Design a binder for these strands. Sequence first.
RNA 1: GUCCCUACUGAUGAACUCGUCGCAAUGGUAAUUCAGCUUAGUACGAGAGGAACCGCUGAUUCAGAUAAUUGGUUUUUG
RNA 2: GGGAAGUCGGCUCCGUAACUUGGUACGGACAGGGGAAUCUGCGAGAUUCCCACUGUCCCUAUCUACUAUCUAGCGAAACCACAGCCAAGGGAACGGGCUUGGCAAAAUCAGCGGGGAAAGAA
RNA 3: GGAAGUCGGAAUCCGCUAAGGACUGUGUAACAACUCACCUGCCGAAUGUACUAGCCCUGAAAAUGGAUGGCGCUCAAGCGU
Lengths: 642, 135, 246, 238, 440
Amino acid sequence: MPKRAVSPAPSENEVDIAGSLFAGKTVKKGGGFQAMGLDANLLRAIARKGFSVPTPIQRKTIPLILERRDVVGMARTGSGKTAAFVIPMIERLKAHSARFGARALVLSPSRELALQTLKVVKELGKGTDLKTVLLVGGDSLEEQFGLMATNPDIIIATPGRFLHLKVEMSLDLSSIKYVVFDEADRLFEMGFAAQLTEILHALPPSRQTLLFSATLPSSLVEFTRAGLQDPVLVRLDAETKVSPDLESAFFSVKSGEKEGALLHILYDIIKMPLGDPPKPTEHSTIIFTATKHHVEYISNLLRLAGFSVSYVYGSLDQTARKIQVDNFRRGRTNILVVTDVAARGIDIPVLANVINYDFPPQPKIFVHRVGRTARAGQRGWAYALVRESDLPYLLDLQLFLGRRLVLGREEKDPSFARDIVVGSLKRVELENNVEWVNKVLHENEDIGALKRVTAKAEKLYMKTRNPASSQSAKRAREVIVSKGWGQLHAIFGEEAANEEQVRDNLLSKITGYKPQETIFEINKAAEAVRSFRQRIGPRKSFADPEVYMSYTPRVKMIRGESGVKIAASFKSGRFEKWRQQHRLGRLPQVGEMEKANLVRNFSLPSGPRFKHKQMKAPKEADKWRDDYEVRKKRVAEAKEKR
Amino acid sequence: KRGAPGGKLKMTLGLPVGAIMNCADNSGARNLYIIAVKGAGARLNRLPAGGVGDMVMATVKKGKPELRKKVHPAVIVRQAKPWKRFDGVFLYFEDNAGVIVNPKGEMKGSAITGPVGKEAAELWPRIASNAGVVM
Amino acid sequence: MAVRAQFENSNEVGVFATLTNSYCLVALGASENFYSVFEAELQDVIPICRTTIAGTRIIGRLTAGNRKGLLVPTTTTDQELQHLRNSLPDDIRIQRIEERLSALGNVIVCNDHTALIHPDLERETEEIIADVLGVEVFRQTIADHVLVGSYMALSNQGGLVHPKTSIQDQDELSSLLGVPLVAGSVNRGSNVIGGGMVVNDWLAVTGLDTTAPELSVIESVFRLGEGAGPGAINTSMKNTIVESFY
Amino acid sequence: PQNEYIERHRKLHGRRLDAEERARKKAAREGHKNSENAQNLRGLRAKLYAKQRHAQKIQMRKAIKQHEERNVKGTAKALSSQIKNKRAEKAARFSVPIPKVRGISEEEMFKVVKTGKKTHKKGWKRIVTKPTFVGPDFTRRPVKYERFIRPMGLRYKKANVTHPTLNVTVQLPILSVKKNPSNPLYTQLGVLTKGTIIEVNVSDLGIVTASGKIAWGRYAQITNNPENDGCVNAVLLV
Amino acid sequence: TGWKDIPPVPTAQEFIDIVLSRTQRRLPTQIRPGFKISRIRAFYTRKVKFTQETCSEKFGAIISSFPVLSDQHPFHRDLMNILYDADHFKVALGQISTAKNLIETISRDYVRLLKYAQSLYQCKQLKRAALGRMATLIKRLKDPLIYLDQVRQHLARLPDINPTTRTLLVAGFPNVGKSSFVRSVTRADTPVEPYAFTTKSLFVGHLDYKYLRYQVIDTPGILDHPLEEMNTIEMQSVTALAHLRAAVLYFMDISEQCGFSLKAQINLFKSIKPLFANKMVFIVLNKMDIKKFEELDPEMQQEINDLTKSGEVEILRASCATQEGVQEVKNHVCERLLVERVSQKLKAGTHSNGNIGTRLQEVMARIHVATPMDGTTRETFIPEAVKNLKKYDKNDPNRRVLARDIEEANGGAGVFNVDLRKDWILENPEWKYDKIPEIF
RNA sequence: GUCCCUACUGAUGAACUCGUCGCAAUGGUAAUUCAGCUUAGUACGAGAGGAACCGCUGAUUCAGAUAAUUGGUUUUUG
RNA sequence: GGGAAGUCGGCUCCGUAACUUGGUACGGACAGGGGAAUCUGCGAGAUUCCCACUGUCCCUAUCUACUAUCUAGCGAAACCACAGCCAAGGGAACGGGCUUGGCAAAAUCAGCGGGGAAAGAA
RNA sequence: GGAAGUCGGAAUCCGCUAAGGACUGUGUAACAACUCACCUGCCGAAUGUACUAGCCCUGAAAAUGGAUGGCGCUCAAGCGU
Ligand SMILES: Nc1nc2c(ncn2[C@@H]2O[C@H](COP(=O)(O)OP(=O)(O)OP(=O)(O)O)[C@@H](O)[C@H]2O)c(=O)[nH]1
């Protein structure tokens, strides 16, 4: 049944920077934490953890937060978002409050994200008396009662679990003053939008809100516009600015030769060594694809070819995700294949090679994936495979980047770093790799099934992908008509061009042949063909540079833990039943002093949380059973233990 | 070609649709989750079931993350629910267990841990070759 | 001589047949095509016995033996044992062994001088094999595959081993045995050599899906057909092997 | 096989040994077969059969008459093509980016004002169920007509207009509704019914007036039932 | 694998008939005026949507079954351009797509009209209008359907040519012996006639040489013209000679028994060498039994030799009537192709970095034969009856009886009952067929 | 802001002395799909591939029974 | 209690030595329990399996309530124009008695799933 | 490329005539070959083209088993006088 049961796990990564439409006895500007004036205990907390120099995310966000302005942050993973908003946690709270109530709330999509947030919280709150709690599904809900009675000041939670507990408690959230949505992009991708909206309704209007993400989907933009009070939107320096040290090449290749082209670009241009390699490696190539099935197929094909390959797709097991990313960061692998969202999730080192197997729908997505590399002044290479169907997207990219686009070898020395160069690959070994792919597909059945699955996925993506613009389509048509579409690429050598324009002239003369009559003309069918051919027969600076006006710029249902649709407010009464078991009194109303008796009753275990807890008495001893006496002793001991 | 075995005699079916079993090969999978069986006849309100030697479709509930990625075919090898063999012998195994196979009938793994069902060994030659104990 | 055959419609002839230098065992089922191809290749030179073990057709993967003896699992019935005894001459010794690994054809490969066994066989089974088969018994894993009977086929002329076996292990096995060994496949890319082929000193039967290059490798290493010679693979057929199984 | 292999088989081995006789006898039996089909098969299949036979007999009689005559013996597409080619040229190579948007529909406006007004008077909404022409998109109607809702599915913007003397039909935009001869309220609302005078843009025709100018608007009478036919058909009064 | 799996393309009338018969026969067709107006609207709207869905499926099936010319190999793309006028082919498919879109728009418009219909008569008229418009669009798409059906039939009959394999392209002027050699080396039926252009297309045969499969492509035949006025037939020829890496066998007739001059033959060879830039060229001299090479004037002889003294073009001689040199020329050309391919595979495996590839390691392991270090062999127990035997053949009158023949005589595969005790070798032969006690 | 007659389904039945053995008007009506073996790697095919009739053996669903065996059930309250 | 369904579930601290009250190196400890089994001679005994959350569903278990054929005796009420077998037709979306047909055989018992109940219209 | 009436464009004449189209189909790679149009001999007396008027078949039908009232009726027990 689950062959594309719900949908391809990596759907798309939509992004929109139009969210930016929201708006010597005097140490001089040392860009320091002490320069922003954090308290002494916090400063010693930094001194122990070892972040000596603030990341740009911290430098641009912490002072605005200290000024108490609503914040929407854009950064790629590993930039320092979590520290960037968790330093304000303790910097603002400064102490535990005896009065009942929570004051800081952090909402994270997944349990592992909640856990990493929990560690950043604890090793920054080392020293303070602030109480921090974690609320995720799968934990003991009675223990969650106990922690809520233990009265944390900071609550890090998964929105569904927090919603269920809030409905079970009738929590008064008016005491909460700080709200963080950590990776709300993945929140909306996972579809917690209704839960987040009603939680936002539940929270009081007087709060300070941060939303941290890598991208800004339109749904997230609308949510921020509806729920944030004058949000300041911050970028991590230059993601849109393409690195000048990046040199790009575009290869016109066919659907039946995509795999051959990828093998060619790895073997001949990138000169990739085979086998296990003897902090990234010297080669360090990433491959961006469209679908998880594409990732599977390409990873398996490259592994058959003998390359050191790691794969990360959207709905991958988290342990395997950690394993693959660890191998990539430690240099045990050279190929890293991701679609878009796995790459967004993982923290990518500096890379030397970026290969676009499937051309992006958005020039913005392209800019993201290529800004992944060529950072800190290091040179980088970006090779992209383009089809005739992907050509309008390439022209949209050309318009977006404002770069001159050269076809084949119209220029003797086109600038790979400043110009968008499109060309073809060497036919001889391109056909060699294509024959290799055909042979391996015809031999191995598993890879053949993978090819069929990824072909069906490609059809689905073609049906569901955002189309390009009319002018881009027309320019695609005209450049296809033009000669440069089929010419050899510039990187392959002027001598190679010598043989190419020696031989291809009459090959072009073959290709551009117009038959006088078809085979059917060589009956009613023949008459219809002749008439239809006859019908289709061919049809016979004055601008003031200063002030010329230009045309162009410059009961509600919610999904519960069981997965069945459930009413938003469903008080099952198990909190009532909870204090019925525990014989507890009225829970402390918001603002009253905490009860040390309640804390001692339900505070926490003695450290590590061990999942396995199951006490059964052993079966009754049988006289005819061999170990009768010892089993009787065990049963008696269990009875004494009760 | 549908993976319906030929010549199989009647036995009591012991693994229905939506059933968790162990994985007997070194392919890295630990358990399988039967969701569908081959050759089933659709009648109202009946859950399909399969016996030793039947091909099924299953998702790896735990094991190797490469295998926890797609619905794999599998031939079920051991059945805890007792069944009768035509020599009049009623028999059963300790657990329920199967092995990952391609639709042609070839295993992804290279060895089988534990014994193999006699019907499965007779029906699929590759399992008979990769089996160590046959009863 | 090397011939291609199918049991019923299956290319795995080693599952359903057991060929030695003094007898042949054939699974019994429906028609007589499989028995008849074996008989046309062995026109009463050595006896052919239509047999079943434990009510199964997998006699090839359940029985192991050479011209001096035959071993069958404890699950074999007295009737099947008596059938085998009456069908075979007295110069061959037949025994049932009480081994937990009852897949004898999967756990034992034996030529007429040596036997190679699954490492986890019992000691008593080891002396029983060494006595009945009259061979030197060694424990080894072939290509890290613990089922030697499934992943290697052996004769007194040579032996063809799993396609993904290291050169060092291949040389060590060749030294320990005394015959040439080659890493090859049967039935168009199948690794289960023992299950896809039965071979004696002058006859091999493979599946109908066995390709021409790999059938020539089989004939060469097992010296079946005119000159043959394991060395011809390294001299006359290199171009063929490189072009076909690249 | 790789080429005209059935033809090769024909040339090498022939046909079945009685195929010519079978074909001749079937062709001879065709007359009785046709009569049996005409007299036996029944129900929409006989109707299709009878229509086909009528067409065949008319074609055969026309062929016989034309052959007898020939043995005894010893533009609108052009104007339409010119108009379409001019339109294609203009729309393909004089089209430039322009802020192009539209207002909301009267249904959306009515839903919004109804959210604003709780008590719904019974039948306060009468939908005009006849096809209409409006023109602009986000217009505010007088209170006199504010509750007449004309749906997008019923609105029409172009009509197939036939010029009689220059015999040709072309698709032309509708400029205004001049008179519905059934109701002044309909002609105020733009209701398009049979025999209805409308103003049509005749610029593409290139009609030369007496003074030498090109006509940019003429009267055309709707001569079909647009409520029954999902198209508007007009004849130009010239 | 081919293009035989393209579904048949109906004519316009058949298309209209299929669509309308389905929309009337797979749905109920009785609505009454006394029913609710909402029910009437639902009935007629359902009829309009079904008609369109059947249409869009059959249009989409047509659009997706036919090959896309851009994604094919250059050889296939050029051959399809030669055979079917690729531009007009694309025009026809685009018309199919535009009709699909227009029918979809008709359906949406009439669904809204039926939404706001007020009477059963009005709904009936709307449904009839929508259906008649769809029928009119198909009637317009009369001719493209005929053209596409012809293309589909020709494509289903086209041979399968794998562009990148071991290939022998036999080419040259007509009347030289190309098809004769093709039938000599392969079992492909290529017409052989005394006239000029009997071969009107590309033919494919196959052969086995040292356990490898080899393709042989018979080209129709090329004339001595500059490449711009060549017919579609010899354009298929030059397309095969241009986009197929292979061993070209250029056939000439030293005797003028073909009908074209030797000087013109060498002229055409020089003209089409740039086609034969790197693909390995063998010139085969045919009908030597009519006039051998020595019986020729030496200015032609040295002209042929000067043709040889350039690149790696190799001269061979044969006769396709006496079957003299066909085996030798086949053997030589196949051997040279094999050695070239093995050498280039080895060079490809040996990379500049020096790291040996995984597949090259695998093939080295598969070609390596291991021998015992001591160099001693094992005793072989092969009896003497085997070398005293006679090989079994199915055609010899007095062959061996065989169990297949016994069961076929005594019934069949499911009826013959085998005697398992027939081969029981006991002490007394009469003890066979005895019931051995088992329980007492 | 409005437990009775009958249909159907089964079970008894007075008078024709009780009984045994039958006939059959009329009414009901039942089987279904798939697979495997042989034909056969055959016909056909350049190749890739690749049937069918007779004959044989099983399986799905449906229907009617049955309890040797094998589970389950226990007021045998053994 | 069991089965099923969904999941993102399964698999650092103490003492010691120098340094500015806190850090730095050294030494030691840390990073389970329960139940069920199998194998060698209770044995450092060795090996195998299961431990989750849920506003989800089902089954088992407990409790509550209503649940009952005949015989002897005793013994109502509801409801009741008269009736009760079908199909077609009987202009007024009307049939139960009429036309013309199918048919149709005393007296009963039990079960019961059909009929003997319904509109009013903008 | 080949196109001989018969893959295609346009003209489509004359002789011999009893009559025979610069051709109505089958066919060839192109021919060849057969056939049709037309003509003659044998045969021998009425035919054949389009319409009109009766009766009859079709000219559309769903869903409990039923209806020229029922049986049944065929040189009527149907239709016209
Ligand atoms: N005597 C003789 N005739 C030959 C020989 N080879 C071909 N021919 C003749 O050539 C003609 C057939 O040519 P094909 O063999 O089909 O060769 P092709 O190059 O395809 O030529 P076309 O038939 O003209 O297309 C017949 O007349 C054959 O008898 C040969 O070796 N000897």
